[PDB]
Design a protein around this nucleic acid. Structure first.
Lengths: 129, 155, 143, 61, 35, 299
RNA sequence: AGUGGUGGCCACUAUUAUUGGGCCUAAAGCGGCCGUAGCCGGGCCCGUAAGUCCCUGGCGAAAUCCCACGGCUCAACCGUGGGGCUCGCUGGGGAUACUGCGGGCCUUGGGACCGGGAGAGGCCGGGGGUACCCCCGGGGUAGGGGUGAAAUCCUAUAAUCCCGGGGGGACCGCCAGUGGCGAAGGCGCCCGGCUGGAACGGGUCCGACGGUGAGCGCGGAAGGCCAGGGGAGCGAACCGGAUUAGAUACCCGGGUAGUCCUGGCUGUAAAGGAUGCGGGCUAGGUGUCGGGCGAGCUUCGAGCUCGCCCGGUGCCGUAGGGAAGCCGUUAAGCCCGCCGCCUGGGGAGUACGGCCGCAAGGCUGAAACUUAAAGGAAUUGGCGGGGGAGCACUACAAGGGGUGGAGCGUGCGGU
RNA sequence: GUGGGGUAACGGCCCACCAAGCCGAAGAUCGGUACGGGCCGUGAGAGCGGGAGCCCGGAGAUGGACACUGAGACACGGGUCCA
């Protein structure tokens, strides 16, 4: 069955990137998936995006620029304070600041560098580089 | 169906993303209230009634018509049935499973050495159990209400 | 499938699974049940003291052919009897019947048989509180 | 595989040959759509689209 | 009777069915000595 | 030999829970089993010839006997419960070639008749007590307990005594059967360490443990102990209707003083139920007496 | 001014694997299905703020630890100052993205219903089939059988063999499949009745009703056992005839249980796709089975040919994975849930115990001690009472020559 | 639970009555083993291992049992008994 749209969508995206396909659709469209996708779009790894209703859950269409090397989902929602980010980054990012992490804090889901800026911890969600 | 057969068969069918009821129809909402009470009062199960409407009356979906009595809800055949107290107490699908189980059990009593039907009995039973648990959670059945072969015979 | 469970609310089965499969290995099981020290003739003693009874030479396992000298010693701490190899060139000439001796492990793999001499587990160090190595070199004198 | 599936089954405004009744009918009915007044069958449900017998004016969506 | 597939190989070793039968003989003999 | 019960040694221990009131799945299984058997058996007024069985008895088909789950019960369990019912004089059971044939007794069809609507645990307790008051082997075991016997050897000496009383005509056969069962298990419980088998002494100790007994295992032995509160209570109940012999074994001084020393315990059941039972047994004592005479006696 | 031996602990070891182990062939998926607790769960709106995060009070002693400076010559040690901890807490405030919690709203997952159609899906009644065996009659002598040869074995009241007629148990060939159906084991003569399931066309009706499954339950090849029937052929044991240094075998002639039927037990296997199950992604082509659509053909029955969609089942194979063998949209690739299993090889599926079974046995299961390997894939050669070839007069097919038989010369061995 | 006794004191702590509760497969009960913590060894670290030495707390005086005096003990250099 389906237990999390986000991980499957990120895996699908990465796979399509390996074959270098140009346009991708994510079937289970949610608000959270849209917000996270906007979040890394802010940093340029993906280009335009759109939502299209289908009368069931909407679909999310993206065109890929093929500059991502791996976009995975951190399933077990590890909560982390401000200080320990470097501990987790070493676990998922290849090098210093190489890409981002996605954290849901009290204000929402946004990048991890910006999270360090505002100094607000939260739940690790996904990573992409 | 994959709970037991594990067969990925896709016999499902398509319903486009239309929100408002179609223009080309003519029947009014109260008109179809009248029609559904007419059809239902001869004893037709709600899926059969919806099929009847789609086929001869040519009305795509009762869901497409908003409930006049509730702006926040869309009109479903069951809600019309209960709008006049003719909605059945025990919901339909589970009653179907009940009667199927009963008739099978008679055949089995006649035929003891058909173990394949024993397996079928186990499966349909587990189906009834699961739906019973579901409705118990949703409170559409008495909590103390139970499936029992004898009362099923009575039903 | 994916190595499971991993749920945020599922640590119990994780540690259960881990602890169960710990029992598969051998060394940790040996430590906790204390099997070595309830089968140890020396009771974890780095050395033991005993009395000599007889001298026997053993045939080196093939393809090594040789008469490796060794002795039979009953130790004083409990009264059990064991075999002890005697290293040294003409070593056996010094050792005699009815000799107080000091014995320790031989250093084979897992303290076991050392190379081409099977069965033996121990070597002698001091005889009558006198180290055997110098006796082999003749620097010291047996009492 | 289309991103959104479409309904291959269409609705039909059809005319009963006997009494000249007008009816909206499904392209893939499941029962015997019987005329309202004359009572003649107009379409018979088959493995795919049921075989229509009356005369067809127009298609809908 | 739990059974290890690797033992089914004959390489330098008597056939496994007869081993199983022989040890069954031993089991019945010892238990009948117990009775 | 006479009782080949295998692989259910601890199964009958569950009846100790009946003394207290903590329900358990085992007890409910026991209750459903026993009353199912009771309905199964008919009470033909006649039946003593080898041919009367199979024409006025009930054949048993074990595979038909099922729990209320459409699950199954190990056949030795059913064997054990039926052995108990016979031993308490409720079921007339006969072992024939690979089949067991049964019928209801006169005690049955009266106890159930008057106590139809009671709770299942109450029905069990009253069945056991009714079996106990009348002259059954269960009564013999109970009297042995009263005389301080707590071992297979005590009950063996009791059985030798009563056969050497020579007035044993009521229960020569059943008591001899009890002796036989004691044979071929006395070694298992004592000499051979492994027990792995059940005799009549065990299915008596269990069955009494549902009223006043607690039993200990040690290398297969079945050491017995009584309490004194409920023991006193049912002793008074027995004195209420003296439809039974001492069997020539009088209560020892120690047991007598312990009974006399102790305080008073609630009378198990409702006093109305106790009185109904009392008068029921009193008015029909002779009929049950002759029934049991035919049952375990000879003439 | 320490170096060496022994013994104990961490690393080495991602040989304990949450970070992070594997389970087709090296040890490692239950024979299959069902399902409880547990674990993990569709989308949207509204409210809480338990978890979650930030600020703030109290509190987590000292000793030990990190850093600067100072005193002891320097250091180690000590002091001054600053920082930290097993961190298991707790007061108040703030935040609502997630998780949890209550209310509502909606179908994609899942379920129900209906229309034709397919299939060795199951049970039950009836009908037949060819074949074999027995029995009766009729015909005809002189053998049949069987092996590599033979022999045992049947027959001259007549065999084998041919014709006529009667009875019996087992089975349902070719059509047949690389086909189908079943969860698995399994399922094949014809007809009638009862019954399970799926796929396809329709979302018609329900609204997350779900995946997994510790403990639980069910059925589940052959064989074995229990009680009663049956027993044509075949055939454990057993009895005879042969071969053989040796026959307890392979071959042959017989032959009991069994193999079948009625009721019950036993829970097994190379029950192996040696691959636990659900969802999403990741190039293709090729045929058949089912269903639907589009056609074209049609002596007009989807009957015949093509493309497409789904469903099942193979082959080839791009990328890719692997020690390789090889796998590769029916994944042994990348993610996502849950359960089972494994931690060098023997000792061992053993001992002891527990539980199950009438019994044989079933399910659980050590340790002592011994060993460097055990094992998996795979290259070259070698070898085959394996195969496929082509050569040979130091081979053989065909001819011809001469020894072993007498004696001499002559070398070797035995004396 | 009731009502009491006893205690520096609350409390089945103890006693009389009333009632049958209480714990358990997120594993009681039973057995094995062991003073707990600050800490210490190792590791890049996740982690694993140990709790002798200094400090805090607990427990003990051959095994058991019992008192007197004392604000404070059932008291290592005070007392009584058994082994």
């Amino acid at each position: 069955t389906l237990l999390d749209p986000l991980a499957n969508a990120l895996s699908h995206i990465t796979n399509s990137e390996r074959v270098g396909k140009r346009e991708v659709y994510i079937k289970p469209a949610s608000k959270l998936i849209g917000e996270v996708l906007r979040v890394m779009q802010k940093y340029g790894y993906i280009g335009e995006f759109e939502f299209i209703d289908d009368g069931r859950a909407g679909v999310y269409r993206v065109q890929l620029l093929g500059r991502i090397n791996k976009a995975g989902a951190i399933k077990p929602r590890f909560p982390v304070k401000v200080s320990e980010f470097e501990k987790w980054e070493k676990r998922f990012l290849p090098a210093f600041e190489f890409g981002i992490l996605i954290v849901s804090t009290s204000q929402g889901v946004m990048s991890h560098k910006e999270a360090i800026e505002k100094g607000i911890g939260g739940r690790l969600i996904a990573y992409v580089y | 169906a994959r709970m037991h057969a594990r067969k990925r068969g896709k016999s499902g069918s398509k319903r486009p993303p239309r929100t408002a009821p179609p223009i080309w129809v003519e029947y009014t909402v109260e008109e179809i209230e009248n029609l559904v009470v007419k059809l239902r009062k001869e004893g037709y199960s709600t899926a059969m009634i919806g099929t009847i409407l789609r086929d001869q009356y040519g009305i795509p979906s009762v869901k497409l018509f908003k409930d006049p009595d509730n702006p926040n809800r869309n009109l479903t055949i069951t809600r019309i049935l209960e709008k006049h107290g003719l909605a059945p107490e025990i919901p339909e699908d589970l009653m179907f499973l009940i009667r199927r189980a009963v008739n099978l059990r008679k055949h089995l009593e006649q035929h003891p050495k058909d173990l394949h039907s024993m397996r079928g009995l186990q499966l349909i039973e587990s189906k009834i159990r699961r739906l019973v648990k579901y409705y118990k959670r949703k409170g559409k059945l008495p909590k103390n209400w139970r499936y029992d072969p004898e009362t099923a015979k009575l039903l | 499938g994916k190595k499971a469970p991993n749920g945020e609310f599922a640590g119990r089965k994780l540690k259960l699974k881990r602890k169960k499969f710990r029992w598969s290995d051998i060394r940790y099981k040996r430590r906790v049940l204390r099997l070595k020290e309830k089968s140890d003739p020396l009771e974890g003693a780095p050395q033991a003291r005993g009395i000599v009874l007889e001298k026997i030479a053993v045939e080196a396992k093939q393809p090594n052919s040789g008469m490796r000298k060794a002795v039979r010693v009953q130790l004083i701490k409990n009264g059990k009897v064991v075999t002890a190899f005697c290293p040294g060139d003409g070593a056996i000439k010094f050792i005699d019947e009815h000799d107080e001796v000091i014995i320790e492990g031989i250093g084979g793999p897992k303290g076991g048989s050392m190379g081409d001499i099977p069965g033996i587990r121990y070597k002698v160090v001091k005889v009558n509180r006198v180290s055997l190595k110098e006796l082999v070199k003749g620097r010291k004198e047996k009492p | 595989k289309p991103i959104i599936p479409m309904p291959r089954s269409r609705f039909l405004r059809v005319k009963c040959i006997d009494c000249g009744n007008e009816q909206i009918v499904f392209s893939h009915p499941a029962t015997k759509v019987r005329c309202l007044i004359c009572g003649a069958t107009l379409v018979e449900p088959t493995g795919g689209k049921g075989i229509v017998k009356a005369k067809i004016l127009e298609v809908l969506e | 009777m739990k059974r290890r597939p690797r033992k089914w190989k004959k390489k330098g070793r008597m056939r496994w069915k007869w081993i199983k039968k022989r040890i069954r003989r031993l089991k019945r003999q010892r238990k009948k000595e117990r009775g | 030999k006479v009782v080949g019960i295998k692989g259910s040694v601890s199964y009958l221990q569950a009846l100790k829970y009946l003394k207290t009131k903590k329900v358990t799945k085992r007890l409910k299984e026991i209750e459903k089993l026993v009353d199912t058997l009771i309905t199964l058996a008919p009470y033909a007024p006649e039946g003593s010839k080898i041919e009367t069985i199979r024409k006025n008895y009930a054949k048993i088909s074990f595979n038909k006997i099922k729990t209320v789950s459409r699950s199954k019960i190990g056949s030795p369990r059913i064997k054990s419960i039926m052995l108990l019912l016979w031993n308490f004089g409720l079921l007339d059971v006969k072992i024939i070639e690979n089949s067991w044939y049964v019928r209801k007794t006169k005690l049955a069809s009266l106890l159930e008749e008057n106590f139809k609507d009671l709770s299942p645990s109450e029905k069990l307790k009253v069945y056991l007590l009714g079996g106990l008051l009348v002259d059954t082997p269960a009564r013999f075991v109970y009297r042995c307990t009263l005389n301080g016997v707590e071992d297979y050897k005590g009950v063996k000496k009791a059985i030798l005594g009563y056969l050497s009383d020579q007035r044993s005509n009521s229960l020569i056969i059943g008591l001899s059967n009890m002796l036989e069962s004691i044979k071929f298990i006395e070694e298992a419980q004592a000499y051979s360490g492994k027990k792995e088998y059940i005799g009549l002494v065990d299915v008596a100790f269990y069955g009494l443990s549902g009223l006043y007994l607690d039993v200990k295992r040690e290398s297969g032995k079945l050491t017995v102990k009584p309490n004194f509160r409920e023991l006193r209570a049912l002793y008074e109940i027995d004195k209420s209707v003296a439809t039974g012999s001492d069997y020539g074994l009088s209560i020892s001084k120690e047991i007598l003083e312990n009974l006399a020393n102790t305080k008073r315990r609630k009378t198990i059941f409702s006093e109305e139920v106790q009185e109904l039972l009392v008068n029921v047994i009193k008015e029909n004592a002779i009929s049950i007496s002759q029934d049991l005479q035919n049952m375990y006696g000879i003439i």
